[PDB]
Design a protein around this nucleic acid. Structure first.
Ligand SMILES: [Mg+2]
Length: 821
RNA sequence: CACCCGUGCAAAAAUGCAGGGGUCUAAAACUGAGCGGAUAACCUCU
RNA sequence: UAGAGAGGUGAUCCGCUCCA
């Protein structure tokens, strides 16, 4: 987008009165080129200048890079920020005017630079991205007890990693009713039949059958996630602030359960790596009659699992496809062992390429990089494939004829006695040499879907890589960086980055218990509305697996009867897919086809039936999107809970936060609540004394003040409780009963929230504005665009977040829209 | 097609044109060759 | 016609490596 980024300007920093500029290095690193003080620059990195300064002035800098095509761009001097037309230049502050307090929190003192603030913001992003997935996981585990649904202070809410299971059992005989209820809730949870849906966490094999873990292990696994959620979404006090970063100091039981949970996939991958692929290696060694067997298994492990030496610069799969084309191996007879044949051929190609065919690989990579046209690309691929086939014709023939039918049985029954000394060097690390943070993260992802698992892992690696790059460039300048005593967890950022990269290689979705199949047939029976085939068809479906985890089957069955909701969601379906779906089971235009398909979906009944796939697909996508929309407000509430304490440390009289969470935006504005109402009216003088730069502008200050008078503490409290507990989705079958016409997922989610709020506040007196909002909601049969900004006011101090979270069209990145007024 | 900031030309104190922002939001990076993961769709054999 | 598995293919989102 920006021409400055294209020109190669990575970042612009300002320390003291001197300004440094960085450019992109190898990977995600950084390096200094230009330093400018008092419009006078001295070059650095003489060996390879990414860009050069055409002209220098106090206003800005002129650069022309060589990253790609010669592109000229102009960058702005950060020292002149906030000091325009308004001794008149200084290091820029934070938009929230909360920089010195954060710098004092994570470091000894203020550093008067603009790098540490970026590092702190990147650190905060870790908690910000952990909150959403932690609350999603805790919702997934809380989905149990669906039949006897109740809403109160839940068992998972009050879980802390202070008392072990030894002390927890003491509540069994205690006369205290409050603790008796908690212990009974835990006992009821431990006997739930649906626990098998997370067999990768609560189940362990025992000589062999999968069996339920011991009680203390289960309690530890539950309470770890519970405490993680409570710490990340709430605000701690005392020594519990630094729980995640002083994770090294738990009790023994949690360490043991983390070790046993994380070790099982490693044992299944590494310990029996020989046995799983024995039929392949035993013939590969025959093919390589003059190589070391230990080196061969080492190379096979490197290729198949870690892919450490892969990515040489061409698709080996395409090379194999072009090499085998036109030969007899495409025939149907070899289809039984076809996958093993491709694996052997690919490994042979790789091994030949890494050892001897190095110059050829380099030439192929250079030729691929030098050209752009696809015709030349495929011609070069075929040219290399012909030579490769000519060289390797005999070996693949040897592999193919040695992998026929009963010969595999003879291969399997025989034993093998390889030496494991050379192989263990490249083994992935066991649980004995793995940090607690990665173990806890892995335990967290046992309750997430594939998309969520990938997003979490990738964002974590990206953030840690950014932290490492900032640490390195901080080292380059020569300033102090050493963290405080209680925040030393980030000192070894490189170790955690490499560890997470290793973890990402083998992380997979949680496997499902074999014995749970009986429960599947009854649950899938109810999700199709067949009350007192399907098991063979839809149980294995991934949509069913990701729908049963995050939703009550009965509520999902009931919520599909709402015709407009189903009608809207299938609009995003590509034309070809729905066109195929329609004529598949129905026996003139796209819109009527969609409407008829939605009507057929709504009235699904039983007593050619390929319609089931579309129903599960649409249920899965709409539920996932509704969950994702709610995830944003969890982030906002977590940010509020952090910012109230940060501002209190800053010196502002924020006051109590839990009783009324509008206190944050009230303290920033300089207005104080009096006798239940905001007495003061708007005045321009109040804008100049805003606690942060966001509320300095008069118009948005007045808008926030006007909207604040229509907010109520009880409504905001209930909205907060609904957001954290996800009660809007948990009671979808009632809150979506009488919708008329939805226009986007934002509107659907907010209508759900409105209906929930109206349902609960039906028997309590309320002030006039809320009554007017309720009257508007019921008559229009759609979400009100004023209540949405009325109860979203606690995030008012962050004006940008306010606008994004209350204006339809500014909320979704993929669906831009117009702005009001 | 949101927010903030700088510069040059208009001032009636507020607009236009042209740029930057990991220190704004779920939110910093153009092209080419590849790796991994996740959800799909199509074809061929059983 | 609708119901198993394997292989391949045109498209999507996130991360990562190399060169310009
Ligand atoms: Mg940021």
């Amino acid at each position: 987008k920006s021409m400055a980024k294209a020109a190669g300007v990575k970042s612009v920093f300002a320390v003291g009165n001197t300004v440094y500029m960085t450019s992109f290095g190898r990977g995600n690193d950084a390096v200094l080129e230009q330093k400018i003080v008092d419009t006078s620059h001295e070059p650095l990195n003489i060996d390879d200048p990414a860009y050069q300064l055409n002209v220098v002035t106090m206003n800005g800098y002129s650069v022309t890079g060589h990253r790609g095509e010669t592109v000229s761009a102009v960058t702005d001097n950060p020292l002149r920020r906030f000091n325009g037309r308004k001794p008149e230049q200084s290091v820029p502050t934070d938009m929230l005017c909360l920089k010195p307090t954060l710098e004092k929190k994570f470091f000894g003192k203020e550093f008067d630079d603009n790098i540490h603030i970026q590092l702190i913001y990147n650190i905060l992003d870790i908690e910000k991205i952990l909150a959403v997935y932690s609350t999603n996981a805790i919702y997934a585990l809380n989905n149990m007890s669906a039949d006897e649904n109740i809403e109160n202070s839940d068992f998972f809410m009050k879980r802390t990693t202070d008392e072990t299971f030894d002390d927890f059992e003491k509540k069994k005989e205690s006369t205290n009713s409050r603790e008796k209820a908690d212990f009974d809730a835990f006992e009821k949870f431990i006997g739930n039949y649906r626990l098998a849906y997370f067999a990768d966490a609560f189940y362990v094999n025992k000589k062999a059958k999968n069996v339920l873990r011991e009680d203390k292990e289960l309690y530890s696994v539950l309470t770890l996630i519970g405490k993680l959620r409570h710490w990340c979404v709430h605000s701690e006090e005392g020594r519990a602030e630094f729980w995640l970063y002083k994770l090294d100091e738990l009790k023994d039981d949690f360490k043991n359960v983390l070790d046993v949970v994380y070790n099982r996939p490693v044992e299944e991958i590494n310990n029996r790596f020989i046995e799983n692929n024995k039929v392949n290696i035993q013939i590969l060694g025959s093919v390589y009659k003059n190589t070391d067997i230990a080196e061969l298994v080492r190379s096979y492990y490197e290729f198949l699992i870690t892919k450490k030496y892969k990515n040489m610069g061409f698709s080996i799969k395409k090379l194999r496809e072009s090499m085998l084309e036109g030969k007899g191996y495409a025939d149907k007879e070899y289809d039984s062992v076809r996958n093993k044949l491709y694996q052997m051929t690919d490994f042979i190609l790789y091994t030949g390429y890494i050892n001897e065919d190095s110059d050829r690989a380099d030439d192929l990579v250079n030729t691929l990089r030098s050209s752009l046209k696809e015709d030349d690309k495929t011609t070069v691929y075929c040219k290399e494939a012909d030579y490769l086939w000519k060289k390797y014709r005999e070996s693949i023939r040897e592999v193919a004829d040695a992998l026929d039918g009963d010969n595999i049985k003879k291969l399997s029954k025989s034993n093998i006695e390889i030496q494991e000394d050379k192989l263990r060097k490249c083994f992935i690390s066991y649980a004995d040499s793995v940090s607690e943070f990665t173990k806890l993260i892995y335990l967290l992802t046992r309750f997430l879907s594939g998309k969520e698992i990938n997003d979490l892992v990738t964002t974590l690696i990206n953030k840690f890589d950014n932290i490492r790059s900032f640490l390195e460039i901080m080292d380059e300048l020569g300033l102090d960086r050493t963290f405080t005593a209680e925040y030393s967890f980030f000192e070894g950022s490189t170790k955690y980055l490499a560890e997470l990269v290793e973890l990402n290689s083998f992380v997979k979705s949680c496997s499902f218990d074999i014995n749970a199949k009986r429960t599947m047939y009854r649950d899938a029976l109810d999700i199709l509305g067949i009350e007192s085939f399907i098991a063979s068809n839809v149980i294995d479906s991934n949509r069913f697996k990701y729908l049963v985890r995050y939703g009550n089957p009965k509520k999902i069955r009931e919520t599909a009867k709402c015709k407009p909701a189903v009608r809207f969601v299938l609009n995003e379906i590509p034309d070809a897919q729905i066109e195929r779906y329609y004529e598949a089971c129905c026996p003139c235009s796209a819109n009527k086809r969609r409407e008829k398909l939605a009507d057929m979906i709504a009235e699904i009944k039983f007593e050619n039936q390929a319609i089931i796939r579309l129903y599960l697909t649409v249920m899965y996508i709409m539920l996932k999107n509704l969950v994702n929309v709610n995830a944003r407000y969890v982030i906002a509430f977590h940010c509020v809970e952090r910012d109230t304490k940060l501002y209190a440390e800053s010196g502002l009289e924020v006051g109590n936060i839990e009783k009324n969470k509008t206190n944050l935006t009230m303290a920033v504005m300089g207005v104080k609540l009096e006798n239940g109402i905001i007495k003061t009216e708007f005045d321009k003088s109040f804008a100049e004394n805003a606690a942060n730069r966001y509320l300095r502008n008069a118009r948005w200050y007045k808008l926030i003040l006007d909207n604040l008078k229509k907010s109520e503490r009880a409504v905001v409290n209930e909205f907060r409780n609904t957001v954290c507990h996800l009660n809007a989705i948990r009671n979808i079958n009632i809150n979506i009963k009488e919708i008329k016409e939805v226009e986007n997922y934002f509107a659907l989610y907010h209508y759900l929230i409105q209906k929930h709020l109206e349902n609960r506040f039906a028997d309590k007196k309320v002030e006039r504005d809320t009554g007017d909002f309720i009257s508007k909601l019921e008559e229009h049969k759609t979400y009100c665009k004023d209540f949405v900004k009325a109860y979203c006011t606690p995030f008012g101090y962050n004006l940008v977040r306010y606008k994004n979270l209350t204006i339809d069209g500014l909320f979704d990145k993929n669906y831009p829209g117009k702005d009001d007024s």
